[PDB]
Amino acid sequence: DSRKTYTLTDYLKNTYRLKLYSLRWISDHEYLYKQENNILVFNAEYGNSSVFLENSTFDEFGHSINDYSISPDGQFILLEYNYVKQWRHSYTASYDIYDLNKRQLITEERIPNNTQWVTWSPVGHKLAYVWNNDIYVKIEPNLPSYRITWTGKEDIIYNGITDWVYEEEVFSAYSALWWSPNGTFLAYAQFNDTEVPLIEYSFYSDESLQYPKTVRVPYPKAGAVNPTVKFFVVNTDSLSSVTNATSIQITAPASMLIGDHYLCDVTWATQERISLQWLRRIQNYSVMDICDYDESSGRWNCLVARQHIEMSTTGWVGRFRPSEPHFTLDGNSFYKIISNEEGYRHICYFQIDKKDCTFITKGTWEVIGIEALTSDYLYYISNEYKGMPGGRNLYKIQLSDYTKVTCLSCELNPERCQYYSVSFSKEAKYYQLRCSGPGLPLYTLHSSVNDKGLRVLEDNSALDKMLQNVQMPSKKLDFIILNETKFWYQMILPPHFDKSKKYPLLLDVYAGPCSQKADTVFRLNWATYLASTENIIVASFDGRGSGYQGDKIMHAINRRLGTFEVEDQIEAARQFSKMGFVDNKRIAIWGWSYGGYVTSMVLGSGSGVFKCGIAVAPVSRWEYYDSVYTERYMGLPTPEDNLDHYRNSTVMSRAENFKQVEYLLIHGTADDNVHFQQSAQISKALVDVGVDFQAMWYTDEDHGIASSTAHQHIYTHMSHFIKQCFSLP
Amino acid sequence: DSRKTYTLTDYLKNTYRLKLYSLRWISDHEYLYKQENNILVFNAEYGNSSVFLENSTFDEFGHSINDYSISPDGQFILLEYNYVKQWRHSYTASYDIYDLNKRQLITEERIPNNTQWVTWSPVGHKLAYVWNNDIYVKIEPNLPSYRITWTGKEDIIYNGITDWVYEEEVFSAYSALWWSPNGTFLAYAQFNDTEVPLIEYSFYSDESLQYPKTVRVPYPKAGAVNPTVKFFVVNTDSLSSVTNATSIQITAPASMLIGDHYLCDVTWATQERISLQWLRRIQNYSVMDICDYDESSGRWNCLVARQHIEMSTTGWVGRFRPSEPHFTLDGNSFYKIISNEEGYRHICYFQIDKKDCTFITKGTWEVIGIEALTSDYLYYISNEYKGMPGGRNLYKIQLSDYTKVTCLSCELNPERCQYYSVSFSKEAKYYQLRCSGPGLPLYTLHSSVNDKGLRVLEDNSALDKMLQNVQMPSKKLDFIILNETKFWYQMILPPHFDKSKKYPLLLDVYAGPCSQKADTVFRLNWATYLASTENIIVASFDGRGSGYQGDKIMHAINRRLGTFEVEDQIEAARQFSKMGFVDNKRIAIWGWSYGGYVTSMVLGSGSGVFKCGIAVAPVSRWEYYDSVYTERYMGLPTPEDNLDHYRNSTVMSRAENFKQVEYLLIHGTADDNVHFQQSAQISKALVDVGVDFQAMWYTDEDHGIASSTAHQHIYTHMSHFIKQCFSLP
């Protein structure tokens, strides 16, 4: 075979790009798409389009626009620039509104610089933005803004935006604003991190900064004081320049106010009904409140009889947090994915007045998410097809008869497509299907009335042609049994794989709670190069604690992090080493974050199964990690709760067992998520027991070590390491 | 040869130990010494002794006594415990005075815990100590102490003790209080670091600390705001008679007050005469003031007729600072080492009220230091013998006839002793000579009346015996000539060294201003093993900028750090290569501190001479290092001074060149001296240009990385690296 293999440079340089097709539904019949660089509008039914905005309309803007956002009515466009990243979702920027009618950019009453967040109303073109931790509203882009809040105070009071832990572990967003459907009310949360300790670390910046700066971020570690939260709703239709806006507060339920708790979900049901979910610090009990607007009193009332309790006796509630409800048109009922009697996550139908929900789906498989709802059907994605937890398809169930379930993606192209995600238009008149594996990504448009296939948006013909000139590796998805249970794994096999030969093996690991490293998704990554060029087999295993297979597996590691998930990887390796094509003398292991944790716990387990391992930004001791994520699985690190296990699941305690393995520890000094502190403590422990090891720190890089240069440098360094570790002497 | 070799474990485990003989003169006739664990007192004249304090006395003290101190009058002993290190010289501890006579421990008016510094008066048993940055005095060990200052303030005002930069760069000591000869007066310095920027960095501490601590230290980097200082003197004899004894200030001379300056030397001449030396921020001009106590005003006056100036046109003043003066008993004249008309430092005789001194020694060699002065003789140490800059010997000159100079150590044992050190009794009646090379250390006692050897105190017979059964390396000390100038170097050659073979060479480098890596001292270090076991030739070279050879060589680097000292090391390598017994392919380089900086600079020069190099705690950009030391050689980093060379002599600007070598970067994270920032900026520059290298950080280790575990870990790590870089298929 004279074809080139997939090299490290291809991965690092993106020599082979997967074409995408990111669209944005602006109605039930049209969607926006970024062609060349200008914006076009498409009619889903025919495929014809028109330019919605010339890629040259802002040639002399005098600023590079980071991103845009058209108002719902297509009347305005919010140009974002001066982008400056903060954590995973947060960031600041400067904004400018450009009237699409007058074809002139508004120069009056502009959004302030260093705006923390902005958002159009769902309908029309109102604006709500957060500045210096306060909320403002603009009924018209060129009119003054109303200041909705006055308590904003950096690192203390957040209004409309999340603090560090809420953004990363609860909302996966920086936004803490929620417009009501027609945009009348603006619901927002308020966080107070007054007593939350600050994580502190150095930032060196450019070489010209003489003194390094100390970054201080309110971050609650396991057991520390968490931020507190309040909810509010304000009417934007009745705001005045004279008096200040009045926000009506909706206090949490009594079962929540008896101790620490979190706001974990906000969802409008109708124009005057809002539902909220609260979660106790001990995350196995949550309650939903449904609040109706009292047009007379002007206040919001949430009738007890409308409260819905959700709790688990075997673990935490929900996959990472209680699922979102999907209300019906009238808002009188709703569907919500909850764990069932047998511990499998399915869709349950709820009446806001009745307390017993009804399951409309069942079986030893799970519903990943509810994607769309009509009076006749509910569309969702699950891993039911062929009973493969790693696969995903679009299904729809008839609401009048649950026995009638129809898969809409299963048979489209079975050999190429086994993992879809979907995108429906405003009224579910149309939907885009996105297939991401096992073969190359495929995007298609469909109509709901007859579930007919309209057309192909992107099939990646190009990439496919070039990939043909390459010796691409293959992927094997399968399972092994452990104690009657079925656990899945996948192997990235080198080209021209020969079962008579023996290859070294690299166990790519994550294994966090509800994780899944064994799926049918097609990926171009480091593993791709290792198998294509170094002829290294890259495997992954989903053991206990893994997700999408029911709580018996997922909850297996409840209050016991660092046990079964770590054991199962070892047992997984142990079994792969027993296979004919694996060289038991050359088996490595690596992970990032939780994978780093697991990778380290495995190397210090004393199993003798692994020769070397690489841990990138690993967690080393749970009391070092954040409260919301750690406590969810571990509980509180108090003597009367689970402190003992907190102290027994550290990497440090296993230092000596590293004497017989080659270890490479990497971490960014500016990691605000998994603090460098965790790696510094791992290293000190190894030094304490005299174990040599490899290390690499990245100045000013954070948890993702994603800067262009750092990204290439870390993968290059790790590659040298794995290569040296597998070098046949 | 079947004898074992000196191994790494040998060096790391202290298998072959150098015996020592540390005595403490308590008078002009006897000294204290620890045979086992008890303290013994020896009669120097006959060598007979007895137990001053037997190891049984403090068994039930309930504390580990770290160190002890006897009051001048021998009536009390100051016990030190609860010792907690801080910087290079500073620390806090607890103390308990023991009443040697009543053989009882005092429990009244005890010195407070967390005392920063404590010292007896030169005579009697008065005590002076610093607590919470203020000065206190105890006339009697059991009586209440008097408070001398009320301005103390953590990290802001220091009375009696130095700040970070004064301790490390100006006084090499933590204390800043000077008792007068008979103890009547107590003088002290006061430092104000109100506007001095702070260096900040994390300290992780034990695994049990949830949130790392941020260590903050007032530390002025190059060109930043320096601490200001003030001098005072209090009459301790008036304390019991006065309510609040007043501290009299002796202001600096106007020639210093015009700008930033430093108090760099305090020396009492008589009971009522004290001398002060001030140095301008631009360290090429110092002034000495000799101040006398005016009894009728209780004030201190410094007559201009006694003000002496000491500048330099080719560099800074002194080796590292203006030298200390040595006054004759009447205080009317003094001796002092200063650079002469040829640039060689020699002893000059001064008459306090005469601006022209007389040199009492001369030639092309230098006086290392004045050790003792009697009415008839002045004893000094120089490197005049055989013209060896790396040699050291005790000399005696006749005050009445300068042509009368006797060397007291030159011939005692010429083959085995070339590097001497001395310790005279309280009145120079006896002196211990301490030989440290080229043979095993030798300690001997002598009598001044006739310069006769009283006896040998330690000769290291045992060790010599042990070392006999080991293939120890040999050390060659010689010179090469460049531009008619002699430049010394030393080589640790492996056993059975053969000039017919080619040996890999490791260049041990420091090369800071006034440094000296080539000398006659005998050592058992990492190099010993590299030559003995790994058969590696470890060489060091003193090029331009090195010391003890005149200002022509030492001031060659004036305002140009990162140049000649760097090139000369490289030119050194070539020369050794020209010597025919070096593998031109296996030449490595390594250094600590300035050593690390020069190593990096060399490695990034592109000479293609060095294959690999190791830099530990290196300086990388002079603007990151402290004022006093940096500015002393580089001036100020301003456009109108020397900013251009500051920005042009950094390691970072040479990143692209490290693509030609194997680099190992190592740094302690709690390094208060050479901040981690320095290596953090290097690594970042390398990553920014796609250079692969090896790094290693030591959690919570300071600039010395001397903790027991970290010490073994780093050398073990560096050993693998060197052996890898020199591996030869």
Ligand SMILES: *[C@@H]1O[C@H](CO)[C@@H](O)[C@H](O)[C@H]1NC(C)=O
């Ligand atoms: C698509 O074509 C129809 C007529 O065939 C037209 O009415 C519609 O506006 C077009 N859509 C776009 C956005 O070009």
Ligand SMILES: *[C@@H]1O[C@H](CO)[C@@H](O)[C@H](O)[C@H]1NC(C)=O
């Ligand atoms: C939005 O709903 C509110 C409350 O039901 C109503 O008063 C308002 O007029 C509605 N706005 C529109 C245009 O639907």
Ligand SMILES: *[C@@H]1O[C@H](CO)[C@@H](O)[C@H](O)[C@H]1NC(C)=O
């Ligand atoms: C934030 O919480 C603190 C208590 O920790 C409270 O005193 C303060 O008033 C709160 N801030 C506001 C104004 O909500």
Ligand SMILES: *[C@@H]1O[C@H](CO)[C@@H](O)[C@H](O)[C@H]1NC(C)=O
């Ligand atoms: C507006 O209300 C805030 C508190 O909500 C108060 O601090 C401020 O003084 C008020 N001023 C105005 C705009 O009336």
Ligand SMILES: *[C@@H]1O[C@H](CO)[C@@H](O)[C@H](O)[C@H]1NC(C)=O
């Ligand atoms: C939630 O977890 C706690 C701690 O393990 C447990 O005591 C409690 O019963 C759980 N909640 C329930 C009843 O499911």
Ligand SMILES: *[C@@H]1O[C@H](CO)[C@@H](O)[C@H](O)[C@H]1NC(C)=O
């Ligand atoms: C040595 O002998 C002398 C004889 O006068 C005696 O006084 C002295 O104490 C002895 N040395 C010691 C300290 O034991």
Ligand SMILES: *[C@@H]1O[C@H](CO)[C@@H](O)[C@H](O)[C@H]1NC(C)=O
């Ligand atoms: C110390 O010197 C002072 C000042 O000259 C003098 O008054 C005092 O008596 C001396 N102290 C002693 C030890 O006698």
Ligand SMILES: *[C@@H]1O[C@H](CO)[C@@H](O)[C@H](O)[C@H]1NC(C)=O
């Ligand atoms: C220290 O200096 C500051 C100004 O730099 C001054 O305000 C303060 O009084 C000084 N402290 C002293 C000398 O006691």
Ligand SMILES: *[C@@H]1O[C@H](CO)[C@@H](O)[C@H](O)[C@H]1NC(C)=O
């Ligand atoms: C002693 O004098 C100093 C300086 O005048 C003064 O600041 C301090 O308060 C005084 N202490 C007492 C005990 O009065």
Ligand SMILES: *[C@@H]1O[C@H](CO)[C@@H](O)[C@H](O)[C@H]1NC(C)=O
């Ligand atoms: C002291 O150093 C500065 C900077 O080089 C220089 O301009 C000045 O003339 C020097 N003075 C002496 C004593 O040479």
